[PDB]
Design a protein around this nucleic acid. Structure first.
Ligand SMILES: Nc1ccn([C@H]2C[C@H](O)[C@@H](COP(=O)(O)OP(=O)(O)CP(=O)(O)O)O2)c(=O)n1
Ligand SMILES: [Cl-]
Ligand SMILES: [Cl-]
Ligand SMILES: [Mg+2]
Ligand SMILES: [Mg+2]
Ligand code: NA
Ligand code: NA
Length: 326
DNA sequence: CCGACGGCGCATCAGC
DNA sequence: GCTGATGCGAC
DNA sequence: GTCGG
């Protein structure tokens, strides 16, 4: 928050370009600029000063000058006034409504929360759950509740099969004092890059968490990724905890370190690291790190025995999770 | 210039 | 039914 | 919107 006013402005610009303009690269540019400015340890006094940071160019520098002089950006003031932009921006805050659906709903006269509730028949399953928990999903999760949630998931996972390992990643693993959701990496030795020796490995864990009423709703579910809703249990006479988003990713056990690197993030950190890998002649996904031939086609997976190995391949100093909140 | 911009799982739909 | 393109996802 | 070559 040293430069909170500027990073707020760029984040709002990013959301506009994403949600309304459907200009994903402009969205990514604004987020990169906000990220590099957020970690800049001086209170910025001019666009010129910010234009020294990689990712801040001529246009954003101009916007920082307008913002530092007036406290505001006319481009954003009129965006907030535009009814279509405001409606599209709002609707995309419902889980399952993306830019395209939001604009299509706006065309059909569906523009408000009350509009959405009247038109549940027009919503797919994901969207209906996002509407149902609209208020809950915008609340953050205190780290203390993340600790209680972790304890349930790991213990319940242990009850299904003592050989599962569940690791909470995302902002939690980066040490955040609050999280937007809970992200769980799951491994089991029967599932490796060589073979799947046991079916329903993710299903059995989802079922156990549903059985004890931790998982309450499913947004999407396949063999390796679960996206849904969970809730802490409350004591007698206690108000209920909000419902929370939970994501679970089942990763081949021999590919744990690439998987935990990916699932720890942040997303911008992953983008930065993967772009640098490319510049160094490697490609990184949640499973492997592979070299790029002269062709550009990926080669064979390189041996990985820690997170640090992946950093070493691309000639980066190791960064602890807490230092990856870009 | 101007081409690139990380990478992929699940849901839903068009076309066969 | 399958394959491939698209939306969505913090995207 | 920004960057590299
Ligand atoms: N566009 C994306 C989105 C996500 N990811 C990866 C990194 C996330 O940490 C990780 C979890 O994805 P996430 O959306 O849960 O992001 P968090 O860092 O946990 C921030 P939160 O506390 O949830 O509000 O998945 C990514 O690589 N690329
Ligand atoms: Cl774009
Ligand atoms: Cl791979
Ligand atoms: Mg998260
Ligand atoms: Mg998540
Ligand atoms: Na710059
Ligand atoms: Na949404």
């Amino acid at each position: 928050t040293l430069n909170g006013g500027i990073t707020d402005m760029l984040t709002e610009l990013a959301n506009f370009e994403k949600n309304v303009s459907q200009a994903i690269h402009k969205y990514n540019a604004y987020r990169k600029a906000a990220s590099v400015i957020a970690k800049y340890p001086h209170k910025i006094k001019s666009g010129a000063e910010a234009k020294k940071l990689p990712g801040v160019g001529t246009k954003i520098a101009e916007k920082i000058d307008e913002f530092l002089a007036t406290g505001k950006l006319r481009k954003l003031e009129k965006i907030r006034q535009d009814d279509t932009s405001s409606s599209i921006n709002f609707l995309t805050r419902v889980s399952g409504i993306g830019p395209s659906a939001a604009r299509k709903f706006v065309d059909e006269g569906i523009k408000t929360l009350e509009d959405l509730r009247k038109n549940e028949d027009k919503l797919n399953h994901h969207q209906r759950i996002g509407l149902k928990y609209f208020g809950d999903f915008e609340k953050r999760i205190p780290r203390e509740e993340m600790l209680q949630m972790q304890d349930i998931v790991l213990n319940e996972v242990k009850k299904v099969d003592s050989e599962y390992i569940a690791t909470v990643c995302g902002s939690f693993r980066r040490g955040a004092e609050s999280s937007g959701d809970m992200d769980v990496l799951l491994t089991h030795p029967s599932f490796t890059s060589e073979s799947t020796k046991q079916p329903k490995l993710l299903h059995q864990v989802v079922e156990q968490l549903q059985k004890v009423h931790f998982i309450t709703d499913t947004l999407s579910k396949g063999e390796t990724k679960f996206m849904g809703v969970c809730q802490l249990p409350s004591k007698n006479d206690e108000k209920e905890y909000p419902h929370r988003r939970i994501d679970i990713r089942l990763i081949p056990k021999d590919q744990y370190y690439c998987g935990v690197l990916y699932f720890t993030g942040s997303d911008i950190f992953n983008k930065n690291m993967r772009a640098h890998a490319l510049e160094k002649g490697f490609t990184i996904n949640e499973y492997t790190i592979r070299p790029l031939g002269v062709t550009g086609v990926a080669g064979e997976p390189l041996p990985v025995d820690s997170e640090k190995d992946i950093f070493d391949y691309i000639q980066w100093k190791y960064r602890e999770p807490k230092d990856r909140s870009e």
